[PDB]
Design a protein around this ligand. Structure first.
Ligand SMILES: O=C(O)[C@H]1O[C@@H](O[C@H]2[C@H](O)[C@H](O)[C@H](O[C@H]3[C@H](O)[C@H](O)[C@H](O[C@H]4[C@H](O)[C@H](O)[C@H](O[C@H]5[C@H](O)[C@H](O)[C@H](O)O[C@@H]5C(=O)O)O[C@H]4C(=O)O)O[C@@H]3C(=O)O)O[C@H]2C(=O)O)[C@@H](O)[C@@H](O)[C@@H]1O
Ligand SMILES: O=C(O)[C@H]1O[C@@H](O[C@H]2[C@H](O)[C@H](O)[C@H](O[C@H]3[C@H](O)[C@H](O)[C@H](O[C@H]4[C@H](O)[C@H](O)[C@H](O[C@H]5[C@H](O)[C@H](O)[C@H](O)O[C@@H]5C(=O)O)O[C@H]4C(=O)O)O[C@@H]3C(=O)O)O[C@H]2C(=O)O)[C@@H](O)[C@@H](O)[C@@H]1O
Lengths: 379, 380
């Protein structure tokens, strides 16, 4: 399997069994094919489909609103916005990119994985239509930056926090690897997308905002490195992946896991069980890439001896019973998020207890959630 | 003599009097309100027809929103039929522009209409009328007088009445139009058209199958149905209907929903049970602002079964002091500011100083731009 942001073992297993005609996998891939048919018809989305322009006046600049920032009723014009941690301001849906990056990301990811598994050219053709439009088109493609992501009206300083939005379309960037060699993904297509990814990676590493985000003390820093790895793996820069793993991910993990295994930076949030899980989800997705080159982020210690397994240990009780959670969680926690997390951390740590609970929680056999495509083992 | 409408007419009258007599404190406050009201004079009138996805009737003048707690089923190839997650608002609701635009229209018209009553400045009647015409009566941009496709649910086979509760956003603006009668901007033809629309809307409320169902609802939908009913009836000056509705529908519905201890069992079973307990009384509170204008006090008048709405305030009052003591499911935090206006209204109606004191202690922010708080200088 090519290097990319997915469990390559589960993907290889599925393609292997599908080609062998194995009855149970074959009908499962056929259901996925039935779910994926809406993505073949779907019109490609573009970041430029917005009316309100960002300060650059360029519709190709991605812009969303930072979700927890609200107008201040006690100001005639509402400015400057104020923060209510954990309460999503519905003004976020006035920026079409917020949901459209998700819609595009799901479509490209699902089609690419189906093309890899089945070899059917119809999936590469449709995946490529989405990739070209979203990334490389000279009129419709998004500029390779996240300058105006999670802007806050009337905030004086530029922030890097919006970079975390990138995870929606960066999974799709990596899945582009899977359609290389099809008839639809031409060398010219690959060149343009390589150049875009090179430019986006330059922006991540050298813009002031990217630099700040790479030093974030909480899950923003972890998700920054998960996204970085997706870009680097798409550009086939495996040596950089190791260096990021050992000079950034491991030190960050070693600083953010407390001695007891809790994540103090996520504990202080209004959705602290969501953000403990979200922080580990960054690690899980980073690990799917590092482990394809022999680096197990779950078991590899930081310089101070801390290991990511300790953070799963701390949380595992509360995944069995989320109502036992003793920290602030102003909205109910979705236990289904732990299924994939516990499976991924479970197999990587040879911990059957985690894997057992992962299948008992399970995923819906017929769910259309694209991130669950590889996890038949959970259905 | 403040016209019959959906507002605390007592507080509205004091403000106009003090403003006219120059009292410094009201004058400063109305000047703040005027500064907030400037965005409504600049704002382009909204229309229900500004939507892309049409309803089954193919008519953009038909109001349509999505029922907020209905989500696609991931386990079905087309997501259909939707399934319900009580208390979790599906962000798809924002794909129907009426959801927020009825709210923006109603706030604008209510604010401009009240400022015109307080200040007499014709610029406020002019802008209010522009919003009212565009939303209600315009032959191309005005909404049809019905709520057939309000809170539709995709792939649901039966028509429901639950979406009628959406009407409270624009029916308050309907009532405020009474305040700009006699201005230069609101012509007899304007009033005639809106009278005819409201008459048509009232006919739909009372005779459509959806309106009949919603009028029989056992929970806060029945209270809000009659509060909206009263706003329409007061705008149409049908004071006898108001009286009949107060005694034959609101009080019996109120009495059937109040438990022995004062709780509201129908709202208790919700995932947002302290919010929906408060939402039920807010229906009663706004109905009362209209009934009390013609001598019927819904806070103190007992129902045929002996239940009285004051009993439901007693039950909730401890939990307004300390919202974390609420023992029932509340999957989102409860905003205590909502209890300010509610406790002031019931307090003044029930002669209960403890409630009015707690209302002023909680207070509203003096400089807030929340239009529904305009009358309540006494709380700021
Ligand atoms: O894909 C999915 O898994 C899932 O994601 C959903 O997207 C949501 C989720 O909540 C997601 O976890 C993520 O949350 C972000 C969020 O977008 C903001 O970036 C928010 O930003 C916070 C952080 O705390 C940040 O470090 C900083 O905080 C500081 C403040 O600025 C302030 O000054 C304060 O006093 O001090 C703090 C501090 O750092 O000490 O900025 C905050 C801010 O609010 O600006 O952070 C979280 C996060 O990652 O921590 O994204 C959400 C989103 O809506 O984008 C959703 O899409 C769902 O459907 C998916 O399934
Ligand atoms: O103005 C403000 O204070 C504030 O309000 C905000 O608007 C929100 C609020 O929650 C508001 O109170 C209102 O809630 C409604 C909601 O729109 C639905 O109509 C919902 O409908 C529920 C009811 O239970 C209904 O009786 C029925 O329930 C049945 C189910 O369909 C199901 O089959 C079940 O098994 O059986 C029940 C049954 O009892 O028969 O339909 C339900 C449904 O979910 O379909 O009810 C509530 C309500 O009034 O009780 O509207 C919300 C909204 O999102 O519009 C918001 O506007 C804010 O900005 C304001 O400031």
């Amino acid at each position: 399997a090519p290097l990319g942001p997915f469990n390559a073992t589960l993907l290889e297993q599925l393609k292997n069994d599908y080609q062998k005609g194995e009855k149970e996998v074959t009908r499962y891939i056929e259901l996925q094919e039935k779910v994926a048919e809406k993505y073949i018809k779907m019109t490609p989305l573009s970041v430029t489909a917005k009316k309100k322009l960002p300060p650059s006046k360029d519709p190709r600049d991605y812009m969303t609103l930072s979700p927890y920032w609200w107008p201040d009723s006690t100001k005639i014009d509402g400015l400057p916005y104020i923060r209510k941690d954990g309460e999503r301001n519905p003004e976020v849906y006035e920026y079409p990119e917020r949901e459209n990056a998700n819609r595009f990301g799901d479509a490209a990811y699902c089609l690419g994985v189906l093309y890899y598994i089945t070899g059917k050219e119809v999936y590469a053709k449709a995946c490529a239509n989405h990739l070209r439009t979203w990334f490389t088109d000279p009129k419709l493609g998004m500029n390779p930056n996240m300058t105006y992501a999670q802007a806050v009206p009337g905030m004086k300083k530029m922030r890097g926090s919006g970079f975390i939005d990138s995870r929606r379309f960066s999974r799709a960037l990596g899945v582009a690897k899977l359609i290389e060699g099809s008839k639809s993904w031409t060398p010219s297509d690959k060149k343009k997308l390589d150049d875009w990814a090179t430019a986006f990676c330059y922006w991540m590493e050298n813009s002031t905002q990217g630099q700040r985000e790479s030093h974030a003390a909480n899950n923003h820093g972890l998700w920054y490195e998960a996204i970085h790895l997706m870009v680097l793996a798409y550009l086939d820069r495996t040596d950089r992946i190791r260096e990021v793993a050992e000079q950034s991910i491991l030190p960050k993990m070693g600083a953010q896991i407390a001695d007891d295994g809790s994540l103090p930076q996520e504990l202080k949030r209004t959705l602290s069980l969501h953000y403990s899980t979200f922080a580990l989800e960054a690690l899980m997705e980073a690990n799917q890439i590092t482990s394809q080159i022999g680096i197990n982020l779950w078991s590899t210690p930081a310089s101070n001896g801390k290991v990511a397994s300790q953070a799963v240990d701390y949380l595992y009780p509360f995944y069995l019973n989320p109502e036992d959670w003793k920290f602030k969680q102003i909205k109910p926690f979705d236990q289904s998020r732990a299924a994939i997390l516990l499976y991924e951390a479970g197999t990587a740590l040879g911990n059957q207890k985690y894997v057992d609970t992962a299948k008992r929680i399970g995923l819906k056999y017929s769910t259309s959630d694209v991130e669950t495509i590889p996890y038949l083992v959970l259905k």
